[PDB]
Design a protein around this nucleic acid. Sequence first.
RNA 1: GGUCACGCACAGGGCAAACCAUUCGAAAGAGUGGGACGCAAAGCCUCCGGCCUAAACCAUUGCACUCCGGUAGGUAGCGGGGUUACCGAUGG
Length: 91
Amino acid sequence: RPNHTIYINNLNEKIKKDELKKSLHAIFSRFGQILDILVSRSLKMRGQAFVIFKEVSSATNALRSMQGFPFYDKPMRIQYAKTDSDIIAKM
RNA sequence: GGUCACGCACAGGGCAAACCAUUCGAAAGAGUGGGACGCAAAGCCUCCGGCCUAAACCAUUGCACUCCGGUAGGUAGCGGGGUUACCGAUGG
Ligand SMILES: [Mg+2]
Ligand SMILES: [Mg+2]
Ligand SMILES: [Mg+2]
């Protein structure tokens, strides 16, 4: 169940990619070092974000701390990622 | 000479990237002036593919790590295709 990556759902789609990453970064750095923040404004990936943490305990901490946090008008819907990939476990 | 091509020239020359100033645009970018990296159509046209933008509207609650909604705008100096044209190697 737990993961290095957290899947943030239900984001304000009107925000630019530039600012969205920057804001999420300013929000989620409180919990540990972030490897990357993936954000895409494609039809399939709109209103979604992946924060990849250095540590899983950091991810668990951020999820449990900021569930339903009012963020650009809307509460974030955080849940662990299904699979991590990137540069986590070999791939 | 005309036509279809061709660019190893000749001659008249033409256009003008980056950058800068300025204007319009939400942006990509375009216009004008300066300026030349290049260009045998770097004249012109978004019909076909690519790539860039995303303010508005419509749709989407979507689990990605190749990249991708509609819509609209841009690139003709990203290809293709359409169309117009100067010179003419005893030129093919
Ligand atoms: Mg960080
Ligand atoms: Mg000029
Ligand atoms: Mg045009």
